[PDB]
């Protein structure tokens, strides 16, 4: 009937998300793969038409798409913001996410563990280097961290505007529906919890065996595709031998033409299958990259009100980190804890009038009614300042009798 539970404490938490953004760029030459160092076969290969042009166009498109994905995900900011030399932010410690001052590679320590944890001119098969180097992506990430720490969400919607980090956290608590004094009397506790959570993420990433499986998946898929493409080159495909020189040597040209055609057909089919699988995988990776860019904008540059988009709990802020083929998000959220039961009422009947809370809920403490906010237990005396009156006491089901204090009442003179 009239039971409600309100949390009396909270625990702020940090969680990790891994998202692939791009895959390797591969280029394939037909003649070398199908039949290389043999101009005799090269003469016959031209008879099949424009298959090579189609294959090269498809590979070039899915190679350009990777640079497009990386640019879309990481080049969100227009200017390279720099962190102040004094790394004091009201008790919050960002040493594990900011770049290392000793400058071994201009990477944060967590980024170092990410780059160490995940592994990262063949027979006609080549790989192309990505347009953006790891240093440039790390620089973009550093700019994003500096902007989101120094200015808040203002830098992502216009000119960058500085604000102390404590006041930014007060803004964010106001955003999640909790008053700012809750931060102002618990700043030290919140800073300690944040530092402990960052340390726990450090240890969990250092210790987990299969935390970064989503990038190993892409790397292994590319490796197995290339390996099976090379392995298929040794199959007979119905000919007497898999060596083109051998079939030229051991048979007459008119009879060897059929076996050459069989080899050509088999190798072309295998290469076409490779291209099709690459196209499908590229589509999947493009969808993942679009998701990563959307998450970057929503969670890093702002504060999303969507439920589970930026981690479990009420979202406060997020921090991006770089990975060899993806991005890593550290979502800081607010989780209530230590809840207590009270008995509640929908309205207060006073002087034949129904009073409703303005921005809170009625709780009774058993024998004394108060007004408190929903997400944190903080009782207060019911007055006319925090309640509004509308209607009589006969329309509301469950109304209860109590007195409403009038601030101007004691001023009788």
């Amino acid at each position: 009937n009239n039971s409600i539970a309100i949390p009396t404490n909270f625990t702020i938490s940090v969680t990790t998300e891994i998202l692939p953004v791009s895959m390797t760029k591969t280029s394939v030459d037909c003649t070398m793969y199908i039949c290389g160092d043999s101009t005799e076969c090269s003469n016959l290969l031209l008879q099949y038409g424009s298959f090579c042009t189609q294959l090269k166009r498809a590979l070039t498109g899915i190679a350009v798409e990777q640079d497009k994905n990386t640019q879309e995900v990481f080049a969100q900011v227009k200017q390279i913001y720099k962190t102040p030399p004094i790394k004091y932010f009201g008790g919050f410690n960002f040493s594990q996410i900011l770049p290392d001052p000793s400058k071994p590679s201009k990477r944060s320590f967590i980024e170092d563990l990410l780059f160490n944890k995940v592994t990262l001119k063949f027979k006609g098969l080549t790989v192309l280097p990505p347009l953006l180097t790891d240093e440039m992506i790390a620089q973009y990430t550093s700019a994003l961290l500096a902007g989101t720490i120094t200015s808040g969400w203002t830098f992502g919607a216009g000119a960058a505007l500085q604000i102390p980090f404590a006041m930014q956290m007060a803004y964010r608590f106001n955003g999640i529906g909790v008053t700012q004094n809750v931060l102002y009397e618990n700043q030290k506790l919140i800073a300690n919890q944040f530092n402990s959570a960052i340390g726990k993420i450090q240890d969990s990433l250092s210790s987990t065996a299969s935390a970064l499986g989503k990038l190993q998946d892409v790397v292994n898929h590319n490796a197995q595709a290339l390996n099976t493409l090379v392995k298929q080159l040794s199959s007979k495909f119905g000919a007497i031998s898999s060596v083109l020189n051998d079939i030229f040597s051991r048979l007459d040209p008119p009879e060897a033409e059929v076996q050459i055609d069989r080899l050509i057909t088999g190798r072309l089919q295998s290469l076409q299958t490779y291209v099709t699988q690459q196209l499908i995988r590229a589509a999947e990776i493009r969808a993942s990259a679009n998701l990563a860019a959307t998450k970057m904008s929503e969670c890093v540059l702002g504060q999303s009100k969507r439920v589970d988009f930026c981690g479990k709990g009420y979202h406060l802020m997020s921090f991006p980190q770089s990975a060899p083929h993806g991005v890593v998000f550290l979502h800081v959220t607010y989780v209530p804890a230590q809840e207590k039961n009270f008995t509640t009422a929908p309205a207060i009947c006073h002087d034949g009038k129904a009073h409703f809370p303005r921005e809170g809920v009625f709780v009774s403490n058993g024998t004394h009614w108060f007004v408190t906010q929903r997400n944190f237990y903080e009782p207060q005396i019911i007055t006319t300042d925090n309640t509004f009156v509308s209607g009589n006491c006969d329309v509301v089901i469950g109304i209860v009798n109590n007195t409403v204090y009038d601030p101007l009442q004691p001023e009788l003179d």
Partner: protein, 65 residues
Amino acid sequence: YQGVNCTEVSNVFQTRAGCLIGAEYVNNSYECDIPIGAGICASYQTQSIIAYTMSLGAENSVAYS
């Protein structure tokens, strides 16, 4: 020439993507016009073909207090 150390077969410049012949390397950084690879782009000087390292953006520092 992709993947070739062009110490083997006007200005000649060596890149992680390959060896570039006919483009002059300049130490200035501009926005990318023609992406070559490994962070090096090329453009028309306006006059000649030049190669350079792309610039991510303008440097900025917010006065945090």
